[PDB]
Design a protein around this ligand. Structure first.
Ligand SMILES: C=CC[C@@H]1/C=C(\C)C[C@H](C)C[C@H](OC)[C@H]2O[C@@](O)(C(=O)C(=O)N3CCCC[C@H]3C(=O)O[C@H](/C(C)=C/[C@@H]3CC[C@@H](O)[C@H](OC)C3)[C@H](C)[C@@H](O)CC1=O)[C@H](C)C[C@@H]2OC
Ligand SMILES: [Cl-]
Ligand SMILES: [Zn+2]
Ligand SMILES: [Zn+2]
Length: 104
């Protein structure tokens, strides 16, 4: 099923800024509830389970002028390599809380 509003989505990601890897990992989030930076949620819209893609997110849709000191510099364009690992419906409590819960 496709990534979209009220889906719980699991992604693997690599983050680069100016060709340097800053982070890599995996996470699950509830889509459409401001869990992620808006630029990456936009790029995730309608993606299929199993789909791999790249997203280049301008600072205005990420960490902006401030960045995130210690990780993301000011005015950084974020280059993401993403794999959509899993997509499922959110449970009632996930929807109430506005976040993802583990499955086990
Ligand atoms: C206690 C809470 C910690 C909780 C941490 C986790 C679940 C672990 C999760 C793997 C995050 C990583 O931890 C190793 C690490 O991922 C980064 O390195 C990174 O690659 C990144 O940019 N990602 C992660 C991959 C999805 C896109 C983006 C994101 O949207 O991330 C989201 C994010 C930071 C959004 C902010 C929220 C504040 C807004 O103001 C700001 O708006 C400008 C946008 C993350 C997922 C939050 O939803 C949840 C958290 O924060 C950040 C550079 C710093 C972040 O560590 C903190
Ligand atoms: Cl979440
Ligand atoms: Zn919702
Ligand atoms: Zn909860």
């Amino acid at each position: 099923m496709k990534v979209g509003q009220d889906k719980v989505v699991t992604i693997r990601y690599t983050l680069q800024v100016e060709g340097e890897v800053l982070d890599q990992g995996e996470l699950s989030y509830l889509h459409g509830h401001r869990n992620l930076i808006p630029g990456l949620e936009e790029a995730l819209e309608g993606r299929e389970e199993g789909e791999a893609f790249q997203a280049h997110v301008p600072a205005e849709k990420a960490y902006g002028a401030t960045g995130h000191p210690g990780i993301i510099p000011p005015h950084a364009t974020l280059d993401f390599q993403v794999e959509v690992v899993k997509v499922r419906e959110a449970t009632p409590e996930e929807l109430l809380h506005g976040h993802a819960h583990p499955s086990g």
